[PDB]
Design an enzyme around this catalytic site. Structure first.
Site, PDB file in Angstrom:
ATOM      1  N   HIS A 157       0.728  -1.317   0.016  1.00 28.57           N
ATOM      2  CA  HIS A 157       0.090   0.073   0.069  1.00 28.57           C
ATOM      3  C   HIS A 157       0.897   1.258   0.059  1.00 28.57           C
ATOM      4  CE1 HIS A 157       0.019  -0.007   4.479  1.00 28.57           C
ATOM      5  NE2 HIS A 157       0.448   1.242   4.381  1.00 28.57           N
ATOM      6  N   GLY A 165       2.995   6.242   9.422  1.00 26.68           N
ATOM      7  CA  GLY A 165       4.444   6.276   8.997  1.00 26.68           C
ATOM      8  C   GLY A 165       5.138   5.088   9.731  1.00 26.68           C
ATOM      9  N   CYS A 179       3.897   1.819   9.219  1.00 27.92           N
ATOM     10  CA  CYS A 179       3.764   0.596   8.634  1.00 27.92           C
ATOM     11  C   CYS A 179       5.203   0.554   7.973  1.00 27.92           C
ATOM     12  CB  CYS A 179       2.674   1.198   7.296  1.00 27.92           C
ATOM     13  SG  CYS A 179       1.163   1.240   7.848  1.00 27.92           S
TER      14      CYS A 179
HETATM   15  C1  LIG Z   1       0.723   3.096   8.066  1.00 29.44           C
HETATM   16  C2  LIG Z   1       1.688   3.798   7.251  1.00 29.44           C
HETATM   17  O1  LIG Z   1       2.696   4.391   7.838  1.00 29.44           O
HETATM   18  N1  LIG Z   1       1.538   4.448   5.942  1.00 29.44           N
HETATM   19  C3  LIG Z   1       2.303   5.428   5.335  1.00 29.44           C
HETATM   20  C4  LIG Z   1       1.542   6.893   5.280  1.00 29.44           C
HETATM   21  N2  LIG Z   1       0.251   6.700   4.705  1.00 29.44           N
HETATM   22  S1  LIG Z   1      -0.225   8.414   4.348  1.00 29.44           S
HETATM   23  O2  LIG Z   1      -1.503   7.625   3.255  1.00 29.44           O
HETATM   24  O3  LIG Z   1       0.797   8.811   3.640  1.00 29.44           O
HETATM   25  C5  LIG Z   1      -0.815   9.178   5.471  1.00 29.44           C
HETATM   26  C6  LIG Z   1       0.047   9.714   6.233  1.00 29.44           C
HETATM   27  C7  LIG Z   1      -0.510  10.562   7.439  1.00 29.44           C
HETATM   28  C8  LIG Z   1      -1.680  10.524   7.726  1.00 29.44           C
HETATM   29  C9  LIG Z   1      -2.138  11.387   8.824  1.00 29.44           C
HETATM   30  C10 LIG Z   1      -2.801   9.959   7.013  1.00 29.44           C
HETATM   31  C11 LIG Z   1      -2.140   8.899   5.676  1.00 29.44           C
HETATM   32  C12 LIG Z   1      -0.599   5.870   5.430  1.00 29.44           C
HETATM   33  C13 LIG Z   1       0.050   4.264   5.330  1.00 29.44           C
END
Ligand SMILES: *CC(=O)N1CCN(S(=O)(=O)c2ccc(C)cc2)CC1
Ligand SMILES: *CC(=O)N1CCN(S(=O)(=O)c2ccc(C)cc2)CC1
Lengths: 304, 304
Positions: B41, B143, B145
């Site tokens: 993702h 962040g 993930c």
């Molecule tokens: C779970 C994770 O770390 N990720 C990477 C960051 N995305 S995102 O879509 O860039 C995002 C960042 C920050 C917020 C508040 C929402 C979405 C999500 C998946």
């Protein structure tokens, strides 16, 4: 979301751990620059530990009696000195993995990570608090002495603890990295009883803020209190008195949640008076006091 | 003595964490040999996450769209492939810090350490269990993930988890390092409800043994039970059924303490039926189910 008892990553400290052997005692040392720090009782027999005269015991030890092993490589000891309850072993090689570091003496209520080691090898890492009675509730077996407690600010490791002894009550006593014990404890196998283990009130309030921030809110009530009224209840429950300094430190969590510190105090007051009634807060059935306000902000904002 | 929720030292895994950026999504990757593993993702907008067609989204991505940063050095991506719910980014440089490793798919009830990371930088380490409903109760912000869960056997890191998503209930879902989700969860922002979070009975019994070993014995009673009688009580309390395999695994803790597994079952039975009556076991007011029998033996014997 979610809130966990979280240690600092241990890598920077792993690279500092060595084995120190003196005679038939083996324990852990901390290798920073060209110095190895270890508990002075490395020079003791178990017999010596009853009434040791460390200056006298040390006279009989030379540099070559301190066997220092990093991984499976021996370090050459070119000097030794006693500072309070630690030995400083000067080695001929700077630890190539020396991180940026400080030695800090923490206050009771402050939290730190412990890297439990045996024979200079890391076994695990957990979060502690220095208790108001200057003990820690660690996990230490024979061989773990010289294991260290630390905080990390970005790339700087602050060393606050070195493990020295277990009290007969199975709580733990140690020193800062200048070899000065926290509290009144001595590196001697004697009657040493801990004082009252009071609850770190400011930490419980930080953790109640962490709970609200993470969606656990059942304990928020309609009440407020005063520092004085609250502190009468704290006294009764062996909670540390809450000061304006504590209120000030909780300011940002106050700001973030929109719950005034004194309101949260009133929530804590009812929890003390009424108990949890079999409910839980962040998966705990008792009030957690080993998160600082700084720890809550760090974990709730995602600092590295 | 003393018993703590203890993570593996994180150093070996710190040396594997990198930042992966695709478009405006940044998260963590795991760099082993010349491959970087990350949640697929990473290629999604937040809009995409509602109903993503990953094969279709991936067609629009080239090697040079995957920005991979280790410390402050960019890695050259020379290949990319999707395996289940992870991307494998082939880089031109083998991670010089690659530890000995395996990928293992753990069973529910098994514990592991998580190194919570943000922008490829470690922030903290905590111990988890894979819940019987195939969620974990982690501490993960946006962040985080691509943060991984792992066990270490001496010098071998077994990677069991990669973090992918938070459920609306603030519990966590992820994959093994082959990109297969634990449980029925999908990397899509949809209605996904966890099943029953049952208690890991064998882990509670291991932790009751850890308690006895550490001097907390008030809950030892005069009773015994049978697997069948015990399991009727377990059912009623949303505890996992105890099998002969579980009894067998508790054998060594049985041997060490001289308390038959079925006696300890009877102790647990009374604790379920009677509650703690405001007492604590190893500083907890509820029965801890995130120590395995293997974890208890490890911490009680001091393995490195
Ligand atoms: C779970 C994770 O770390 N990720 C990477 C960051 N995305 S995102 O879509 O860039 C995002 C960042 C920050 C917020 C508040 C929402 C979405 C999500 C998946
Ligand atoms: C606390 C610690 O690690 N040390 C080093 C080991 N000594 S000891 O006197 O060698 C010892 C080892 C093992 C047992 C069971 C007792 C004593 C104690 C201090």
């Amino acid at each position: 979301s979610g809130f966990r008892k979280m240690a600092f990553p241990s890598g920077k400290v792993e690279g500092c751990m060595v084995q120190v052997t003196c005679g038939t005692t083996t324990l852990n040392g901390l290798w920073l620059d060209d110095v190895v720090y270890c508990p002075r009782h490395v020079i003791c027999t178990s017999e010596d530990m009853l009434n040791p005269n460390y200056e006298d015991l040390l006279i009989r030890k030379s540099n070559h009696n301190f066997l220092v092993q990093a991984g499976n490589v021996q370090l050459r000891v070119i000097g030794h000195s006693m500072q309070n309850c630690v030995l400083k072993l000067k080695v001929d090689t700077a630890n190539p993995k020396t991180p940026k570091y400080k030695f800090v003496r923490i206050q009771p209520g402050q939290t730190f990570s412990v890297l439990a080691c045996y024979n200079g090898s890391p076994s695990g890492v957990y979060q502690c608090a220095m208790r108001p009675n200057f003990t820690i509730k660690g996990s230490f077996l024979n061989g773990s002495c010289g294991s260290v407690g630390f905080n990390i600010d970005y790339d700087c490791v602050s060393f606050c603890y070195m493990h020295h002894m277990e009290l007969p009550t199975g709580v733990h006593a140690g020193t800062d990295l200048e070899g000065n014990f926290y509290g009144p404890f001595v590196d001697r196998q004697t009657a040493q009883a801990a004082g009252t283990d009071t609850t770190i009130t400011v930490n419980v309030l930080a953790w109640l803020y962490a709970a609200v921030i993470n969606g656990d809110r059942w304990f928020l009530n309609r009440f407020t209190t005063t520092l004085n009224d609250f502190n009468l209840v704290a006294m009764k429950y062996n909670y540390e008195p809450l000061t304006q300094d504590h209120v000030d430190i909780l300011g940002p969590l106050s700001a973030q949640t929109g719950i005034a510190v004194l309101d949260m105090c009133a929530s804590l007051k009812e929890l003390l008076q009424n108990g949890m009634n079999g409910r839980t807060i962040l998966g705990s059935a008792l009030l957690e006091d080993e998160f600082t306000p700084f720890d809550v902000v760090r974990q709730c904002s995602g600092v590295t």
